[PDB]
Design a protein around this ligand. Structure first.
Ligand SMILES: *[C@@H]1[C@H](O)[C@@H](O)[C@H](O[C@@H]2OC[C@@H](O)[C@H](O)[C@H]2O)C[C@H]1O
Ligand SMILES: *[C@@H]1O[C@H](CO)[C@@H](O)[C@H](O)[C@H]1NC(C)=O
Ligand SMILES: *[C@@H]1O[C@H](CO)[C@@H](O)[C@H](O)[C@H]1NC(C)=O
Ligand SMILES: [K+]
Length: 321
């Protein structure tokens, strides 16, 4: 059995992966991306972000995003559409604009309406608002927060829901798995959106970790339940477990136990619907270009061969390997 077959057998909707357009000329890569025994879901890594979809005010370009959407439909894989509102990968007409609350609110609603309407009925989920919090649970500064204030959040959710009523709408963030101040602030964002009368369906827990910093399965379950108690679904959205290079048999074994605890916590939680890894092979991992000296974060190595973590994920979904 593959990862998605194992997930569906334990009542998850999917096991899936991110990818990106430049990777699709690598035929051995795409042959395994197309393996629906392992992958039942796809996330576009870059080509549905604001800089990729609205490069000048009022001009939309969907060619690259459409390539990823058509591959998912071609395979019968779910699509998580990613992402509408984020501090990172904005075009300079947004970051450098002369704005008022009124003019940036209109331009934000226009962006969301055009992009969500283009993909209407194709998106199982949208990551509507991404990374709105500092490490201490205060709001992250960005042009939306300094010009519109915290209202930018329910405005984005209400604009996405009017353009595609069938998409589940997620708030997505990292380091929520530790609970404490940041998780409490992500619960408060869920309550902000409900208080405003706007639709929110989900919280995405990105599940970025350094090897050996993942807590017990029962700890993870308690944090996931703190969100499902609000009446939202949860999912792990950008999972990777990074190693300070070079790897050893010890750190590859700890990486396997770490991925095993994360997927078991999702199996055990009612309302946790699925698991996405941030690409599937060390060959194309974002980690080395972001976390200096770290790498080998994924369940397949740079030769596209399975690592110990592949069997750890199967063990966390109750398969003997
Ligand atoms: C989670 C975030 O939501 C996601 O968009 C990030 O993807 C990376 O964004 C930066 C870009 O240069 C990389 O190619 C892409 O993988 C990863 C994480 O921050
Ligand atoms: C992968 O699947 C997509 C969609 O079905 C298809 O366009 C593509 O040609 C496939 N590629 C390979 C190498 O199997
Ligand atoms: C912007 O406008 C909306 C709607 O009137 C409001 O909720 C928000 O508080 C305003 N923000 C600022 C900082 O002026
Ligand atoms: K579950």
């Amino acid at each position: 059995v593959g990862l998605d077959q194992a997930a569906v057998a334990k009542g998850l909707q999917y096991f899936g992966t991110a990818t990106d357009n430049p990777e699709l000329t690598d035929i051995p890569y795409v042959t395994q991306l197309n393996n629906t025994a392992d992958f039942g879901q796809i996330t576009p890594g870059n080509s549905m972000k604001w800089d990729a979809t609205e490069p000048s005010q009022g001009t939309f370009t969907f060619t690259k995003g459409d390539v990823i959407a058509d591959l998912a439909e071609g395979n019968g894989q779910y699509l998580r559409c990613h992402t509408l509102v984020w501090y990172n990968q904005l075009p300079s007409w947004v970051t450098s604009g002369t704005w008022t609350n009124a003019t940036l609110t209109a331009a934000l609603k226009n962006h969301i309406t055009n992009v969500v309407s283009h993909y209407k009925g194709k998106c199982l989920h949208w990551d509507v608002v991404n990374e709105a919090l500092n490490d201490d649970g205060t709001y992250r500064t960005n042009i939306f927060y300094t010009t519109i204030g915290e209202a930018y959040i329910p405005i984005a959710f209400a604009a996405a829901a009017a353009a595609d009523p069938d998409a589940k709408l997620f708030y997505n963030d990292y380091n929520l798995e530790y609970g404490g101040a940041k998780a409490a602030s992500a619960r408060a964002i869920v309550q902000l959106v409900k208080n405003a009368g706007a639709k929110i369906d989900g919280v995405g827990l990105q599940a970025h970790f350094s090897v050996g910093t993942v807590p017990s399965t029962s700890s993870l379950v308690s944090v996931l339940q703190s969100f499902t108690a609000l009446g939202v679904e949860v999912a792990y959205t950008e999972a990777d477990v990074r190693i300070l290079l070079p790897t050893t048999a010890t750190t590859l074994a700890q990486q396997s136990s770490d991925f095993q605890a994360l997927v078991q916590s999702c199996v055990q939680t009612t309302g946790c619907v699925g698991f996405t890894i941030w690409d599937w092979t060390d060959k194309y991992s974002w980690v080395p270009s972001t976390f200096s000296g770290y790498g080998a974060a994924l369940p397949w190595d740079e030769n596209l061969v399975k690592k110990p973590a592949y069997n750890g994920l199967l063990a966390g979904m109750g398969v003997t390997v």
